[PDB]
């Protein structure tokens, strides 16, 4: 069975596609080598199509069934609620793709008669029809990267999603399930429950619990394409262990057969492009589904491989396992056996995995633990990453208007990092000052969910999320310092010392404004003065609403929070 079948109809764009930085960047002030920055377009879709299209052979064993049953017994403790139309409507991002049935995201959020009417009709239809495949749209996604160190460019990812009406119904039937079940099933292994500070803590603690730790990330090639119809049905079998309202159970059953296992792909012109028999990227269960499936196959493969004292951390298709070593040679062998197992379960690797005996050298979720020191000199651990993509996208978002602001997300998730503090914070606060946009809330994504956040709130958010040490870190590791340096060289970003300069001015302009703006000056930019102003815990940090921030992943799920 093929992940995809294609009729020949093109994957088409819906509007003009921008592929390059504007002719004279609105901030060469961030980045000089504009030619290094690019966005993906539908022009590269057929390249992705070729990579993403293959036959899935799948052989399940006793290990897999054992783990599945263990997973199901945990799911059996769960009681899930049906969401009302209203609650599901309020989870719809203001800029979610409009319905073909003559209403859009705003109409849904407003509970307009036409939208609510269609939605209800889509719900009844899930009860009245348990078989007919539900239409989807396939599109080339727009994402910005830095060119490979070789005119090497990634082709566009392909997104597949059903109509806005179906999407609201998914929320009603499955939002509570996808938010609750994964922690219930996978426990400490479910990544999305963790803030950056909590994730690093769990990693570092797992590391130390091993007499002699060995760790490895595992990169599945095109995970979404490796998800089989069987995988999707096993996923449902897990879901079905929840206590569920009768209509939720039927909605789940119908959605599974009519939407999740596959169905026809329609381009933006309304032409039939082909047929999907693998995971769709743009449905509510994509993150939860991918996580359960990765966890299930990986845990079974750990048993097949006789890996010992495995502790896994799973985020959708991102997998990192830490275990007890048996010697360099036996580790290598066991890992090869882990890979042959995952392969039989239909998940071959992209890059073959490698045992790693230094926690700091393992990268998972595009990130790695590193070490620095706080004011008191004490050792502090934090999560970082190669800043290349974050910087490219910051430059793109500076030059072209963008609906979602990755830079704000990266500042929140990576607030303690050397590059987020010196470049990103300095750069964007400067722009915001000049345009008096400091008070205006912006949209950003955290674990796939959309949030609307006021920049004048970063100090609180950062403190409660990362700790007061997020404002004092110094003596960053050599490797980190080199990685950043190399990156500024690549993209033509001015050197750190220059940012220290721009920072002093920004910080001074902030302090002169008093109030929240002043707090941003003291806390966010205290790294820029040698006369380091003593930083005490912020009053607001404690009395804010940061609950729903790290509960579950909603990547591709059309989810809008608060």
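Sequence proposed for the structure above (562 residues):
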């Amino acid at each position: 069975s093929m992940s995809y079948t294609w009729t020949g109809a093109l994957i088409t764009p819906c509007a003009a596609e921008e592929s390059k930085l504007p002719i004279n960047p609105l901030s060469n002030s961030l980045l000089r080598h504009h030619n290094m920055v690019y966005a993906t377009t539908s022009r590269s879709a057929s390249l992705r199509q070729k990579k993403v299209t293959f036959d899935r052979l799948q052989v399940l064993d006793d290990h897999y069934r054992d783990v599945l049953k263990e997973m199901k017994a945990k799911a059996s403790t769960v009681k899930a609620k049906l969401l009302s139309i209203e609650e599901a409507c309020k989870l719809t991002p203001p800029h979610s793709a409009k319905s073909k049935f003559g209403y859009g995201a705003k109409d849904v959020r407003n509970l307009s008669s036409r939208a609510v009417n269609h939605i209800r009709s889509v719900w009844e239809d899930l009860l009245e029809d348990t078989e007919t495949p539900i239409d989807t749209t396939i599109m080339a996604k727009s994402e910005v990267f830095c060119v490979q160190p070789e005119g090497g460019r990634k082709p566009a990812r392909l997104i597949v999603f059903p109509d806005l009406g179906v999407r609201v119904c998914e929320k009603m039937a499955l939002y509570d399930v996808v938010s609750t079940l994964p922690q219930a099933v996978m426990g400490s292994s479910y990544g999305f429950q963790y803030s950056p500070k909590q994730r690093v803590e769990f990693l570092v603690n797992t590391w130390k619990s091993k007499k002699c730790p060995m760790g490895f990330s595992y990169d599945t090639r095109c995970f979404d394409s490796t998800v089989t119809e069987s995988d999707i049905r096993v996923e449902e079998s897990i879901y079905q262990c929840c206590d569920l309202a009768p209509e939720a159970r039927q909605a789940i059953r119908s959605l599974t057969e009519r939407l999740y296992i596959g169905g026809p792909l329609t381009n933006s012109k309304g032409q039939n492009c082909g047929y999907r028999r693998c995971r769709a990227s743009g449905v509510l269960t994509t993150s939860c589904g991918n996580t359960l499936t990765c966890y299930l196959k990986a845990t079974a493969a750990c048993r097949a491989a006789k890996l010992q004292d495995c502790t896994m951390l799973v985020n959708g298709d991102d997998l990192v396992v830490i275990c007890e070593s048996a010697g360099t040679q036996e580790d290598a062998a066991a890992l090869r056996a882990f890979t042959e197992a995952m392969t039989r379960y239909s998940a071959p690797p992209g890059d073959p995995p490698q045992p790693e005996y230094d926690l700091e050298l393992i990268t998972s979720c595009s990130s790695n633990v590193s070490v620095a020191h706080d004011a008191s000199g004490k050792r502090v651990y934090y999560l970082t990453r190669d800043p290349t993509t974050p910087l490219a996208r910051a430059a793109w978002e500076t030059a072209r208007h963008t609906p979602i602001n990755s830079w704000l997300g990266n500042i929140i998730m990576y607030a303690p990092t050397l590059w987020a503090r010196m470049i990103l914070m300095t750069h964007f606060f400067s722009i915001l000052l000049a345009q008096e946009q400091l008070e205006k809330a912006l949209d950003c994504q955290i674990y796939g969910a959309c949030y609307s956040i006021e920049p004048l709130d970063l100090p609180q958010i950062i403190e409660r999320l990362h700790g007061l040490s997020a404002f004092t870190l110094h003596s960053y590791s050599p490797g980190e310092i080199n990685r950043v340096a190399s990156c500024l060289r690549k993209l033509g970003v001015p050197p750190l010392r220059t940012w220290r300069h721009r920072a002093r001015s920004v910080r001074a302009k902030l302090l002169s404004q008093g109030g929240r703006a002043a707090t941003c000056g003291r806390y966010l930019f205290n790294w820029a003065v040698r006369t380091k102003l003593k930083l005490t815990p912020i009053p607001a940090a404690s009395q804010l609403d940061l609950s729903g921030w790290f509960v579950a992943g909603y990547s591709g799920g059309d989810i809008y929070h608060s």
